[PDB]
């Protein structure tokens, strides 16, 4: 749950010379003292209880353990990590609204992928993932990286479709009846059709990327 995490650090105190038959360890109080404490500024103290432990099977084991329940103050990492991560993530959908003729789709999607990868590595340096628990922020960054890779592949396909002409390709009738007629209706587009084959391919590419723009907005919104 970083940076909204709560840690439970312990401090075990024993005598590494004498066992329970020689010295018995007793607690003077049930909690650690905070009478001369200097606040942290990064960590909040929640509870510092102490307990005296024995072993029913050993009979030579005695220890006193203090549980340090501490709570991170999340403003710093919030501002410095979560906000930049959200800003980068919000750009992962724009490639599907960028027109093909602009000739800049690859730049945008590749740059987003680079930024997400860098942030994933930085997060791993700060809070290392482990089999027990992977930080949720890292999980989200990885999921967004997968989506952006899929978007790069889709953008390459859309660009290939966009630059098609009758001199090099022939449009199958099913491509017509689907992409120029049916799918636009579902997406609320209504091809103007005021009046050529090259423009038909340009519209098919624009229909494909609109379909994915919906999904990425849906999935990214669902990413909330």
């Amino acid at each position: 749950h970083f940076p909204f995490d709560q840690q439970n650090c312990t401090m075990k105190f024993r005598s590494w010379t004498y066992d329970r038959t020689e010295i018995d360890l007793v607690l003077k109080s049930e909690v650690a003292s905070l009478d001369d404490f200097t606040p942290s500024g990064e960590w909040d103290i929640v509870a510092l209880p102490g307990r005296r432990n024995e072993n029913p099977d050993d009979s030579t084991y005695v220890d006193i353990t203090y549980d340090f329940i501490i709570r991170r103050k999340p403003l710093f990492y919030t501002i410095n990590l979560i906000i930049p991560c959200v800003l980068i993530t919000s750009l992962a959908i724009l490639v599907f609204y960028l027109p093909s003729d602009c000739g800049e789709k690859m730049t945008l999607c590749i740059s987003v992928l680079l930024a997400l990868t860098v942030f994933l590595l930085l997060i791993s340096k700060i809070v290392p993932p482990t089999s027990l628990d992977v930080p949720l922020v890292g999980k989200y960054l990885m999921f967004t990286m997968v989506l952006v890779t899929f978007s790069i592949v889709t953008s390459v396909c859309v660009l290939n479709v966009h630059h098609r002409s009758p001199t090099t390709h022939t449009m199958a009738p099913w491509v017509k009846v689907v992409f120029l007629e049916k799918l636009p209706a579902l997406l609320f587009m209504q091809q103007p059709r005021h009046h050529s084959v090259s423009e038909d391919w340009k519209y098919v590419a624009m229909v494909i990327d609109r379909l994915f723009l919906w999904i990425f907005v849906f999935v990214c919104v669902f990413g909330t």
Partner: antibody
Amino acid sequence: VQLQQSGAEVMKPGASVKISCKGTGYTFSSYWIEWVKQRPGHGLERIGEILPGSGSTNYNEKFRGKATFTADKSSKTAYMQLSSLTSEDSAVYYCARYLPYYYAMDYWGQGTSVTVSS
Amino acid sequence: DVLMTQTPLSLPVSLGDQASISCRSSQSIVHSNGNTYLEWYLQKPGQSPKLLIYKVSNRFSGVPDRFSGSGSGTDFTLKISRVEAEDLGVYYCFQGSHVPWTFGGGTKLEIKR
């Protein structure tokens, strides 16, 4: 262990009152102090908490800005200051000792009654 | 702030009858240590509350065995085997899982006759 609260108060509307909870017989700085409001009508409403050892404080949304907690470590006393007393603020206020996740509110103050009237 | 709701608002039950008070949370209030922190308090008229149960089931020291607790992620209930004169009061459920920690609405207990 014992939490001794201050005496009853009567205040005019718009004024501010400061009630105190004094804890003895335990490590005062290592236990959170919970402040609870009980309107004469009905209900227990937690106002917030303060850990005297540090300055940490929490407030419930209904009281953010209305109440402010301060603690004195030298004298084992915790204070709650209520500002802009209306007629709703008239109630009995309790202080309780609490350690999250380990010990519940097993010791309470006797209760301090505050009356806002002209 | 997690919202905690108690039912019934009033629970009339004559002496010796089983009593059942239910508390529900607006969210799951489980914790990682294997425990979820729910406590039951009892206040008599003109008195400060008193602890009865903590950590859902664990019973405080010095309280009659008749009291018992049970529940899960978002549903908890209190049980009194037999009711007595001292048992009269208001019962509150307290969640100690998510900051800020909130009280229940209160479930007044009465004896029907």
